[PDB]
Amino acid sequence: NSNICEVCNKWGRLFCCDTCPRSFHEHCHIPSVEANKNPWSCIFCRIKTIQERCPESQSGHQESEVLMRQMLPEEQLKCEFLLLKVYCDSKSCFFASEPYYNREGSQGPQKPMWLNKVKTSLNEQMYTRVEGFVQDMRLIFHNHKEFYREDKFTRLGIQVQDIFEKNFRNIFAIQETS
């Protein structure tokens, strides 16, 4: 196994996947690494299994259909993985914890949002459809763009949104377009 966490790239108390060489901090993995379970398979492995069991799950889909899907176990897993892929980028630090807004010439968002809140929401089964999760993810970046206006820091929102959107299209097998 790797000697660093796959998500944050640090050493520490790591839990090792039994079916691949990745390792994780307990609360870096999503869901948090399970108490018992020998062998244990990480989220990467669990997502690969879904694909292998249903190869046709990789044919192209329309985003509108994906969003309306109910959060059954497989869609719950896919959203957990997509959230984890965002955390894997170091620029996610900016969006992880609860933000506050006090900048001359701007007003804070009406509905603040952040990664750890989405994380808790998934853990608590608060989303009934994929759309719920995706709307909250996109709101994080949209809030950021609006608040920071012409400051160059706005680009951090663009950057992390692009990681989200690429991973969304991959994980949910969105039909490729120009």
Ligand SMILES: [Zn+2]
């Ligand atoms: Zn970690």
Ligand SMILES: [Zn+2]
């Ligand atoms: Zn694994």
Ligand SMILES: [Zn+2]
């Ligand atoms: Zn099948």
